[PDB]
């Protein structure tokens, strides 16, 4: 990985890390619309993103940049404030995660 590329990792880390969990939790694994009743989460999400799969992608190589890293990480922020009602728990939680992704972001070596 590159220098840019090893920040976005720690960064990462540190997202999926127990001091992060009681907010981190509902973006660590692909949503199961199915299994919690939200048979219309597929058609307003047209594009599903969670901490496992940005895991994968950095394991496999696939985020050429950083800037392509911090796409996918606030796409998943995205489609929580686009499903959920402004003033639900779960886009609370997406807000307090998303501050520590943004505030680690932007100290990026450069
Ligand atoms: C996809 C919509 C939105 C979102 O944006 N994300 C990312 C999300 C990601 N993961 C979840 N996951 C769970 C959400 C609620 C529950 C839950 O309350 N289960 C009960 C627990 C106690 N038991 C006796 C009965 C079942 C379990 C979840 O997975 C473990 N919810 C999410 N929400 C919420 C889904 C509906 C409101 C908002
Ligand atoms: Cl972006």
């Not at 590159?2 to 997202?15: A, D, M, V, Y």
């Not at 981190?24 to 989460?41: E, I, M, Q, R």
């Not at 394991?59 to 009602?85: I, T």
Request: hydrophobic content about 35%.
């Amino acid at each position: 990985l590159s220098e840019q590329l090893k920040h976005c990792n720690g960064i990462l880390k540190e997202l999926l890390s127990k001091k992060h969990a009681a907010y981190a939790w509902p973006f660590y694994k692909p949503v199961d619309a199915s299994a919690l009743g939200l048979h219309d989460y597929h058609d307003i999400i047209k594009h599903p993103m969670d901490l496992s799969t940005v895991k994968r992608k950095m394991e496999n190589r696939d985020y050429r940049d950083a800037q392509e890293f911090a796409a996918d990480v606030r796409l998943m922020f995205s489609n929580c404030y686009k499903y959920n009602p402004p003033d639900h728990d779960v886009v609370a939680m997406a807000r307090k995660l998303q501050d520590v992704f943004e505030f680690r972001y932007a100290k990026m070596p450069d």
